[PDB]
Amino acid sequence: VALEKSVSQKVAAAMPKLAPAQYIRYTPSQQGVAFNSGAKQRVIRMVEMQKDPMEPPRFKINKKIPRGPPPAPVMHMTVKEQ
Amino acid sequence: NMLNLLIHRKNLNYLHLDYNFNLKPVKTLTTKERKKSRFGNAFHLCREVLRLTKL
Amino acid sequence: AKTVTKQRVESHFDLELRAAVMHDILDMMPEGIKQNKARTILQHLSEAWRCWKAN
Amino acid sequence: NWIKYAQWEESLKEIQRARSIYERALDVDYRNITLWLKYAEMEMKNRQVNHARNIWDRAITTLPRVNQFWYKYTYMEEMLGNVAGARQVFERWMEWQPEEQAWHSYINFELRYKEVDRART
Amino acid sequence: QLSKQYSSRDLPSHTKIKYRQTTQDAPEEVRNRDFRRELEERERAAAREKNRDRWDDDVVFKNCAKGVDDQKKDKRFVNDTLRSEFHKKFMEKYIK
RNA sequence: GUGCUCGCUUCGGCAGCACAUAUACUAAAAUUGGAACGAUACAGAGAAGAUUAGCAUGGCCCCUGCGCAAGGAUGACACAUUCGUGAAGCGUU
Ligand SMILES: [Mg+2]
Ligand SMILES: [Mg+2]
Ligand SMILES: [Mg+2]
Ligand SMILES: [Mg+2]
């Protein structure tokens, strides 16, 4: 199931519509009773922005930056042989 | 309009597209200009299909 | 990604022959511990191949 | 090339740069024992005891079989005066069941102090 | 950061997976089979098949072509590129 | 804003009720710093003595190209004599 989800996202490219209104409840970390009107929480309605279907790829991805770098321990000569 | 925007988008100011979709050049081209200005078949195919509809 | 092709085949075959010998033998021959004659063993390879071409 | 670069920055006393160079070199080839010795040495030369201590620990952890690391590690601790530390290191080392000579060095270590009971053990 | 670029090759093809069928040789059959018996009997059959299958008063020279029965040079396979019989034939044919 | 309250009740005003419920990269601007393969100028193609054909390999280099094709200078980039210190470890006289 997990793989299939992943695949569908990849396949989204090959096959060029979202309608959810989703609400969230937020606790801040600042508080103080003068920060909001005076609520321990706020509520935000998240809406996905509509994309223009004839809009080209906005920005440029080509840029290239060198591969990032701990080794496991290895745990594994005569003069004549040399 | 599409095709002119493409042309300008790439700063090909020495090309000229007329209204029956003939892509011409303004001046004799320099070597470098000739390289840069080529369009591939995609653009030309589109151009010619548009020409047909304009007829 | 590049695809093997007629232009590239002879180069390809010798590329992966140099690699075949290199991986095999330097993973096979060793205990030089420093660098064991990789440049040199391959030069022996090309030398031998020329010699067989000249009989 | 890695080493020469590190050395040059070390000479200019830009040792934070030097550290990054050594770490980058390690990313390329962590098995190379000269590299590690140069790295630890650099820290010691600049009196950066705790950096050196870290580095030594890493070296013996990832390449336990290299006896050069162990000999230097114990020597450094002995010079610093930390007999207990050195003992601890040697006890780690002995877990690898190493080589006759290593055991001799551990015993001799003990015998630079009286510690005859330890030696016998 | 996934590019909107495409390629001809990439497009769908053979989206269905041909599962093996029962007479093609589904794994079910395979698990049940006694291969060793089958292999022996086939072998025996093959062997049996093989068995079934099988004047001039004046001249310089008396017959050269006496016992010269071709020889198995084309039955020998040789792992040597220049002494394979194939190579000989090739060399014979294309140089004058 | 439209309609309706045998609304007050004239046809003016006022009241009640129903219906109708949150647009927008707000600028018609202001500022802010990478690219033209322009001319000019200097200089001037890998491999061996030279002249040249090319496929490649590697990627903090790209460009043309629908392209897993092919091109871009092979795209560019790729530069025989003779020993001894110092420290540490181990065994020995
Ligand atoms: Mg070619
Ligand atoms: Mg040429
Ligand atoms: Mg090319
Ligand atoms: Mg090239």
From Swiss-Prot, chain B:
Subunit: Part of the U5 snRNP complex. Component of the U4/U6-U5 tri-snRNP complex composed of the U4, U6 and U5 snRNAs and at least PRPF3, PRPF4, PRPF6, PRPF8, PRPF31, SNRNP200, TXNL4A, SNRNP40, DDX23, CD2BP2, PPIH, SNU13, EFTUD2, SART1 and USP39. Component of the U5.U4atac/U6atac snRNP complexes in U12-dependent spliceosomes. Within the minor spliceosome, which acts on U12-type introns, interacts with PPIL2 and RBM48. Core component of U2-type precatalytic, catalytic and postcatalytic spliceosomal complexes. Found in a mRNA splicing-dependent exon junction complex (EJC) with SRRM1.
Membrane-spanning intervals of the chain: none
Organism of this sequence: Homo sapiens
Tissues/organs with expression: Widely expressed.
Disease per UniProt entry: Retinitis pigmentosa 13: A retinal dystrophy belonging to the group of pigmentary retinopathies. Retinitis pigmentosa is characterized by retinal pigment deposits visible on fundus examination and primary loss of rod photoreceptor cells followed by secondary loss of cone photoreceptors. Patients typically have night vision blindness and loss of midperipheral visual field. As their condition progresses, they lose their far peripheral visual field and eventually central vision as well.
Domain characteristics, as noted in the entry: The MPN (JAB/Mov34) domain mediates interaction with TSSC4 and SNRNP200. Has structural similarity with deubiquitinating enzymes, but lacks the residues that would bind the catalytic metal ion.
Cell compartments where the protein resides: Nucleus; Nucleus speckle
Source taxon at top rank: Eukaryota
Stated name of the protein: Pre-mRNA-processing-splicing factor 8
UniProtKB/Swiss-Prot annotation, chain D:
Stretches forming HAT repeats: 13-45, 47-79, 81-112
Localization (cell): Nucleus; Nucleus speckle
Source species, domain of life: Eukaryota
Tissue-wise expression: Widely expressed. Highly expressed in testis. Not detected in brain and lung.
Subunit structure: Identified in the spliceosome C complex. Present in a spliceosome complex assembled in vitro containing CRNKL1, HPRP8BP and SNRPB2. Component of the minor spliceosome, which splices U12-type introns. Isoform 2 seems to be predominant in the spliceosome complex. Interacts with PPIL2 (via the PPIase cyclophilin-type domain); they may form a trimeric complex with HSP90.
Function: Involved in pre-mRNA splicing process. As a component of the minor spliceosome, involved in the splicing of U12-type introns in pre-mRNAs.
Family in the record: Belongs to the crooked-neck family.
Name this polypeptide is given: Crooked neck-like protein 1
Originating organism: Homo sapiens (Human)
From Swiss-Prot, chain E:
Biological function: Involved in pre-mRNA splicing as component of the spliceosome. Component of the PRP19-CDC5L complex that forms an integral part of the spliceosome and is required for activating pre-mRNA splicing. As a component of the minor spliceosome, involved in the splicing of U12-type introns in pre-mRNAs.
Family classification: Belongs to the CWC15 family.
Phosphothreonine carried by residues: T23
Compositional bias segments (type: Polar residues): 1-10
Lineage of producing organism: Eukaryota, Metazoa, Chordata, Craniata, Vertebrata
Annotated compartments: Nucleus
Ranges of biased composition (kind: Basic and acidic residues): 28-54
Name of the protein in its database record: Spliceosome-associated protein CWC15 homolog
InterPro entries: Cwf_Cwc_15
Assembly behavior: Identified in the spliceosome C complex. Component of the PRP19-CDC5L splicing complex composed of a core complex comprising a homotetramer of PRPF19, CDC5L, PLRG1 and BCAS2, and at least three less stably associated proteins CTNNBL1, CWC15 and HSPA8. Interacts directly with CTNNBL1 in the complex. Component of the minor spliceosome, which splices U12-type introns.
